């Protein structure tokens, strides 16, 4: 009845949904003059700021991924906001997109970690000088909770997003239904809805930071 | 509590001020709406019927087909304007 | 009917994953009131790191409520 | 004094004259979408005190787009039958 | 396509060659997995 | 500063208004009974379905 | 769960790629320094 | 003036503002000090 | 070798629709044509149920209320913020 | 009725989320006690974050509770 | 009846929560101990805060018990 | 029967509202320890407070279990 | 059908796995509040030591929900 | 057969013995945060005594997972 | 027979008892990490109390685990 909004749309028998995804690309235009208008100066400052903040720890080699990380976070922070609107589609909640955005990165990090620093990357499986009583019962745990990385790295975001849309739909429905009965309950649930809406405006970026930070330090480790 | 009730009394004064500011803007709208206190005159009916017949003249021979677009766009938009009032009457129904 | 009541039960069970969040919430607010009581200066960063955990707990709370609905209304 | 004019300038009689003087190749489709985007941009955005209306339009447009996309699945709950 | 290549291969070259060697492998793995899963579900529904 | 009607339109408007008022009253009258009866007969049908599942539970 | 009607995964993925690794790497690649 | 100029115009007026492409081929073409 | 900009482009009514519309319509009805025009367009959409009402309606209402609150309370602050960044780059270079 | 059974059971076994509220309440009021015993000055700001936690934990409490009363009978 | 069973089942399962009361009061009087043991000049103040938290969480648990009961005597 | 198993499991469930009281006792005692180890001279009052907290948590658990007994013999 | 009602039961039961994660997350970020207030000159390392644990303790409930999904749809 | 039904249900409600590991590890890592703050020159021994704890938390939290997988596949 | 059903249910339920074990163990190691963080002239006695607490908690979980295996392989 309500999983509808997650159904992949095509106004007819044609491939449209690849336009719901590139639309954000032009809410972030590119400048050619030196000085520019507001909407560009603002985002420019924003980005200088966020980079200077997050890419501090990384070493010099690891400082080549700034583009990828900030583009990742910008794209996602756009999508997850835009999806808020009345009748808009969230191309992230299509779990497949999240898997295809998670795996390659994690794998390529691990591969940089095992192409170089072979012995040491192998070593990170054994924390330093642990009791020699339990080695296997530890180098099993580390190596199982490694492969667990991308799976959660995606699913968290996916379901986190989904739940908010579903909850707002349902609360608004029960709002109308109570309006059938009485007046004040409707206002109660409407204020509830305002709160939820703000909270979603928030998580929709919290998760971007989480994502491209997890990745940043996963590169910090296996660089 | 009582202070909130006192704030409500101040809010009531603010609401009176809100009514006070709205009334002159409303008075300007009233100036446009003050033209008729009774139904419209049947004096210009001749002018309107004659303009209608002149439209029919421009139509029958195929001479209005020399118009520019913007004019016809305008005409059709105001036509649809007049039209919406039909559904408005349905609303009354 | 039987599948219906079973959905009901699974829902009433999945409801409970919110306690981790309620705890984490009270916990981190206590931690904040403290770390401010003995350093009222850097309130700003303390509050930032408060809500950043607030979110990472409500996330899982709503994971659980989401699965509850996912079952109840859409299998 | 000109063959090609703004489609508002042209008349209804020569309407097809305009329809046939103009081109239709996909290159001439990109070379139209671009003109639209750039009119909007250089008129409501690229100004030193751009406002909300410099942006709100495209948002409330995308809205109606994704509403039209959805009309089909919404004819199943109209509260009243005979409209 | 000449405008296309001169817009998306002048700047983006040093990235796909020097840095991103290791992500394309991952995308191939991604293709592997998606193939496997679509095949599995196609099989299971071909049954029913 | 009001702008006098180009009388054509002042004519065209209120006529259509009252046309629509009449149309609405007519629709209301003409439509009430059919829906009343279709719904009441559907109520017969739903009572029958109720007794069906009563005996064919 | 309509995220499991696998029919559409190919296009979603390919478009995500096209975007995340082309357009933004064009736009943001042009931003400037203080 | 300033507003009538571009980044290349700054390459023109100030070569010391130049973001050189050798010691820092990548983006943002310099470190984050 | 680049051109400058205006001070502020096409003025706008309700922050959403441009006025040029209104003026283009001035000759025939002058002032109170567009408003009733839109009111009728909308009462029509609603009457025939080209736009059925559901929860998403109120979701849109809430988001829009939030947004207008934000702008009507922070707009000029952000405007001067940005012009400040501009003048600040000008100076820090100049 | 079996659906009645599962309805009552869902209500009961979903009315448990109160644990989050309780635990967070305890933790927050304790953190207050301590941060106050240290510095008796900023009592106002401290009690402010205190009320924040109070109501923000009762928040998830009432979330769970309204879901219970959501699927009690009315669904 | 089957439902008559679910009656008591639920009216019993509806008291799992007082765990919260337990943990709270524990941490509460713990922080109170520490208070009086770090600044004895606050005894009554912090005792009042303690009875506050006590009442609060005890009420949570006991109204959950009222839930249990109203389920019992549905 | 149906009420037999009903009450059985209702009590086997309500008997779990005790772990919280347990952990509460434990934590209040840890707090007592620290407080004393700071100020070894107010032992008496620290202990009075702690034993009170114990009374309360134990009372809560005992009520949650009296529930189970009544379920047994409701 | 009972043979799938049981799947519903099992998944609805296993949902609650992430409560431990809720806890651990809140706890860690409170501890980070504190250890940043004490010696504010180590935010960096004290953050790198927090989200690590966040990852751990989330993984260990996300697994359980993955298992609930598995039980349901396979 | 309802046999397999309750087999499934038992695996599902037996894999719950991991919220322990969750909260335990949370608390452990917070303690490490602090005990590094007040003494930033014992990092090494500190991380070692932290891993000693993380492990024997994860293990006894995972035995429930393993028990569910076992009881399901074989018995 | 359904005896198998109820036995599987009760066993996979009773096996909850390890949550507390994990939680305890974690809190234990946290406290120890602190206590040593401030006071490193105690290593031996510290470690000893640590191991004692670990064993006590692990055993208070082991009881329930072992009796679950009992209920399964015996009754
Ligand atoms: C990292 C840290 C993150 C921190 C986040 C905090 C925010 C960061 C900075 C962003 C602030 C945005 C700046 C801003 O709002 O512009 C004002 C600001 C002021 O402009 P100005 O020309 O100097 O002065 C304008 C006056 O203030 C004008 O004053 P006025 O008196 O004329 O008021 C006009 C108003 C009043 O007129 C009316 O009363 C009309 C009433 C009818 C309402 C319309 C119809 C609604 C129908 C349903 C209503 C039912 C009731 O008209 C409207 O109502 C227009 C609203 C219509 C809806 C359009 C919604 C667009 C919102 C865009 C805001 C962007 C917010 C982004 C925040 C990030 C997400 C949280 O604009 C700028 O100067 C530059 C704008 C820069 C925008 C940056 C955008 C970045 C790219 C984002 C892409 C993603 C889009 C997200 C969409 C969601």
Residue numbers in the entry:
A (entry chain Aa): 4 to 226
B (entry chain Ag): 1 to 93
C (entry chain AN), J (entry chain AO), N (entry chain AL), O (entry chain AK): 1 to 75
D (entry chain Af): 5 to 87
E (entry chain Aj): 2 to 49
F (entry chain Ae): 2 to 58
G (entry chain A8): 1 to 34
H (entry chain Ad): 126 to 158
From the manuscript:
Adenosine triphosphate (ATP), the fuel of life, is produced in inner membranes of the mitochondria of eukaryotic cells by an embedded molecular machine with a rotary action, called ATP synthase. Mitochondrial ATP synthases occupy the inner membranes of the organelle and form dimers via specific interactions in their membrane domains. Each monomeric unit in the dimeric bovine enzyme described here is an assembly of 28 polypeptide chains of 17 different kinds, organized into a spherical catalytic globular domain that extends from the inner mitochondrial membrane (IMM) into the mitochondrial matrix, attached to an intrinsic membrane domain by a central stalk and a peripheral stalk (PS). This membrane-bound enzyme is a machine that transmits by a rotary action the potential energy of the transmembrane proton motive force, generated by respiration, into the catalytic sites in the extrinsic domain.
